[PDB]
């Protein structure tokens, strides 16, 4: 019927690589930061009454 | 397959109608002309005898 | 998209499963009926999702990511996770299945993304996941106090 | 083309006019036409061979038909005995008396119970297949009328 | 080529339109249509012939139906005997009294138990084949309707 | 084999349609011209008698 209107698989992978490279170019480093910065062994599980 | 044979029978109906129409045309409009041709040929035979 | 729903417990047709495909409880002998009430943040609860799953070269284990998780969460060996995932059969046709997996180890505490090594074999190539259950873990973790 | 299909449709509509032929509308995937349980129904569990240890395990405790039949009678007699209604001798004599009827019934219960169940799953399957056969009968009614014409 | 296949497809699409014929969608490899066990099921185990050594081994110990039936009764009587309720004479008398019903029931249990099991495997297989026959019936419904047309 | 007979019946449908079309063309456009030819022939017979 209709023919040659959609990409192949390989071209889709190539376009996805191009998009990934562009997005990495905009944002070279990981922006997000986490309050917990160490492994579970370092932290000490304690319970407190209400703050102050 | 039983589904397909139904469509075959319907198309056979479609051809049967045309067979009827052709037979009716041949009866109504073609045979009398052949009869007239025979009536014309007999007199020519008589003239040949003369 | 609605806020007017009812919960109906019918003692005929009690089918035990995430997708109601399992053994049926016998109604003629029941000792107690306890509703399981938890919070949204109970054990990496609300926002977890599977992402990828694949086999390993080892005889036993296979690898599984866990996706978005609140920071105050951890997994110990022996924890059980349930999910409803879709895979590609050998013949090339998509299927659906539900399963329960144990864990042996994991990596990535505090970074909100885990990659967990789990026991068992996988019947096919991963496609997607529709439901995930990450409740009842062993290790404690603090959360912001909530009254409800 | 000349539309042979249109001629066939018009001829079929005109020739059989004056009568109603409506086919049945049963939907046969509605879970009323399936055996109740999936793979997890007790139909698909493995059948174990009957052995002597399932009759009696040679112990007063239980886990056998004869042992359970004796223990229930002993429990009933002891229940009457704890109320000051009989003594030890009456309980012992009644126990010894029943000791044989317990065996006689235990030998029969196993053989009859292993069949009383399997005579019911076949009835289930028969009824569920009979629903579909009834649907096919409803379908055959119309063909009967058309054969008449 | 002139597209004969296209003409045939269009002709069916036009001629049979106005009716719904949807075939059933059963998948018949889902393990609900297979006998439960593999080679490891007891169906494939060897059958042992019935011999008199299975009835009684001429020993007080066991390994026979008659011997086990006697030992269980002896154990029950001795359990009542260790409690201060009967003496040796009463125990011996009851033992000797039961020693005939034990034989009478042991002669029957073997012959009935050899059938109690094999009357269930055939019922399992009958149900599992009935599922597939039900599937074929669901498939025949549509043929019935098309035959009517 | 039962799968193949289905395709055979479909191709038979395809041929039936062309049979109908050819019969319709024959009825509509070929017969009246033959009738005109016969009408022309009868008068020639009369002229031969003369």
From Swiss-Prot, chain C:
Q: What is this protein's name?
A: Non-contractile tail sheath
Q: Where in the cell is it found?
A: Virion
Question: Gene name on record?
Answer: 65
What stretch of the parent protein is included here?
Answer: 199 to 346 of 1382
Q: Tell me the subunit arrangement.
A: Interacts with host NfrA receptor; this interaction is essential for viral adsorption to the host.
- Record function comment: Assembles to form the non-contractile sheath that surrounds the tail tube. Allows viral attachment to the host by binding the bacterial outer membrane protein NfrA.
Leftover remarks:
It is uncommon for short-tailed phages to have a tail tube inside a non-contractile sheath.
